[PDB]
């Protein structure tokens, strides 16, 4: 009932449309680490 | 239909081409049918767009 969802799911989809969802995952969580494997 | 108890119909886009986003910032196809709202849904293969 809160008319907010398409406003926000816009920003949900767009971050991976940009791939900046991946950028922000890699920010505080790089996949490399001290153990590469 | 079977899990809810409600009705449906089966129609068609004359393009069948996911629509085409225009430089009119508009559409034919499955999207232009709902710009005009001649339809209600489109249940098939789907491409995802913001």
């Amino acid at each position: 009932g809160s008319p907010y969802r398409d406003l926000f799911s816009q920003r949900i989809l767009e971050l991976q449309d940009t791939g900046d969802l991946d950028v922000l995952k890699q920010k505080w969580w790089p996949h490399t680490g001290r153990c590469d494997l | 239909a079977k899990a809810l108890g409600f009705k449906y119909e089966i129609y068609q886009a004359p393009d069948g081409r996911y629509g085409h986003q225009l430089h009119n910032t508009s559409w034919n196809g499955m999207i232009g049918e709902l710009i005009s709202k001649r339809a209600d849904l489109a249940i098939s293969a789907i491409t995802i767009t913001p």
Side-chain angles (χ1 to χ4, degrees):
Chain A
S2 177
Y4 281 165
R5 192 261 187 194
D6 303 329
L7 309 172
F8 298 168
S9 294
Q10 191 68 43
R11 298 296 183 94
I12 289 176
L13 179 63
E14 282 160 340
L15 292 171
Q16 193 50 255
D17 296 336
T18 58
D20 292 331
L21 178 58
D22 304 335
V23 175
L24 295 178
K25 290 190 287 184
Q26 282 291 108
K27 179 191 71 63
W28 53 270
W29 172 69
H31 79 284
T32 64
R34 47 91 52 82
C35 285
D36 51 356
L37 183 62
Chain B
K2 68 179 74 174
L4 299 174
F6 289 96
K7 281 74 61 182
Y8 60 95
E9 289 158 348
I10 301 168
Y11 292 154
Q12 188 187 1
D15 289 332
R17 297 184 292 170
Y18 289 104
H20 297 283
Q21 171 58 260
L22 300 181
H23 285 170
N24 201 6
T25 64
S26 64
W27 286 88
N28 59 4
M30 68 180 189
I31 310 296
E33 287 282 323
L34 285 175
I35 290 180
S36 59
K37 288 185 181 292
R38 300 289 185 185
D40 292 330
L41 291 167
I43 303 169
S44 180
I46 298 300
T47 51
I48 302 296
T49 306

